[PDB]
């Protein structure tokens, strides 16, 4: 009920090669991506003249000691111009 | 606006050249706006209940807890 606009536009114009999961909840919109393209995806944002995020709020780790990909890195970042925030959440193992 | 803040209009000052002096003046203006809000509340505060309507997310008060039965069950489980 908050930022369907930015999220929808970002998903419908992205290079769909590097998106592994999308969740448009009401708690927070999630782009679960692959750890290989993370920098590419984030550099797409912060630069595109509609979904420019320009501010990174948090980079938190979550630990799940029961899955093959043990860790979970999470980037919470908002768009001060378009009044929206998204959460790009990548997987990550030991080393 | 997470909470009642709509009905509580205020000012939100903004500085023109970001530095120590402008952050300071911002702080004083924020004090004054907070005073505006602190007065707007005790003029609108709607005397009613507080904190819940389900004794499954908020514990029951003392009289009910010590008189009724299921209130004691819920207080026990909730604490």
């Amino acid at each position: 009920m908050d930022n369907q606009s930015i999220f929808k536009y970002s998903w419908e114009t992205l290079p769909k090669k590097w998106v592994k999961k999308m969740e448009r909840s009401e708690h927070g919109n999630r782009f679960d991506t692959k750890t290989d393209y993370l920098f590419q995806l984030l550099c797409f944002l912060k630069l595109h003249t509609y979904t420019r995020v320009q501010v990174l709020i948090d980079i938190c780790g979550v630990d799940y000691p029961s899955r093959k990909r043990r860790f979970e890195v999470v980037y919470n970042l908002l768009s001060t111009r378009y009044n929206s925030r998204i959460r790009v959440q990548t997987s990550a193992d030991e080393v | 606006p997470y909470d009642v803040y709509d009905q509580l209009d205020f000012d939100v000052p903004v500085g023109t050249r970001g530095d120590c002096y402008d952050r300071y003046c911002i702080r004083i203006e924020e004090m004054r706006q907070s005073m505006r809000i602190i007065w707007q509340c005790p003029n609108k505060i709607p005397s009613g209940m507080i904190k819940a309507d389900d004794r499954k997310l908020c514990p029951p008060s003392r009289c009910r807890m010590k008189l009724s039965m299921e209130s004691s069950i819920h207080h026990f489980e909730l604490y």
Partner: protein, 243 residues
């Protein structure tokens, strides 16, 4: 693709034929004469129970396991209901929810109010069942009913103020134990469970009685008030006294 509760190796005595029932939608396979409660279990949904134990006989006595089986009238006791091929079981419908709410309302109405001294507080079925399935407010003021406590030897002390008339102990003592001493006597609200000649219980498995009895009335004397359950850790071992 739905594993039974806890894992439960069904038998299939005649594996050539076995009925199938719809539990809350998706179907499940069931042996010939299995009850609705075990069918729901196989489907993987627990149903609140007080007076049904997998090792004692059935008795539709607590009246808390109610579900609605479409193609039938309004209420149905899950246990003691032999499954039929194709009946449309349903567990989470407003009918069943309100049935459970009302029954829990009646129990907690004429229950005592001494949880913070009654051990099994933190383990009690009635407690957890109320917190998870029952309402949140009671509407009752008048005086309750209270009975005198009872002694059953130095193993099982009872504060019978909270004997909710389940007959679990009676059915156990008459089926598994072997000695017929406990019995439910009285009528209406004035119904107690107790040997009528203040005798003791000269049999083993009385500790099993105190485990059977869900609400905290029959409790081990030598473990009177030493600890709640949430305080101590359990290690799974074997026995060396017996053989």
């Amino acid at each position: 693709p739905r594993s039974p509760l806890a894992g439960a190796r069904v038998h299939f005595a005649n594996p050539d034929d076995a009925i199938e029932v719809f539990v809350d939608g998706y179907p499940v396979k069931i042996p010939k004469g299995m009850t609705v409660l075990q069918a729901c279990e196989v489907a993987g949904v627990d149903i609140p129970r007080f007076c049904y134990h997998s090792r004692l006989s059935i008795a539709g006595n607590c009246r808390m396991c109610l579900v609605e089986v479409e193609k039938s009238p309004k209420p149905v006791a899950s246990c003691a209901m032999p499954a039929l091929p194709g009946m449309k079981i349903k567990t989470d419908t407003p009918v069943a929810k309100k049935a459970r709410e009302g029954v829990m309302e009646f129990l907690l109405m004429n229950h005592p109010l001494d949880c913070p001294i009654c051990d099994q507080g933190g383990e009690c079925d009635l407690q957890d069942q109320s917190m998870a399935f029952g309402s949140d407010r009671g509407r009752f003021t008048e005086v309750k009913r209270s009975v005198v406590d009872k002694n059953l030897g130095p193993l099982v002390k009872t504060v019978m103020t909270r004997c909710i008339q389940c007959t679990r102990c009676v059915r156990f003592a008459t089926e598994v134990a072997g000695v017929q001493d406990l019995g439910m006597l009285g009528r209406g609200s004035g119904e107690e469970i107790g040997t009528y000649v203040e005798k003791l219980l000269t049999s083993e498995l009385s500790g099993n009685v105190i485990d059977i009895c869900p609400v905290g009335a029959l409790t081990s004397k030598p473990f009177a008030f030493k600890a709640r359950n949430w305080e101590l850790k359990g290690t799974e071992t074997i026995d060396v006294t017996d053989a």
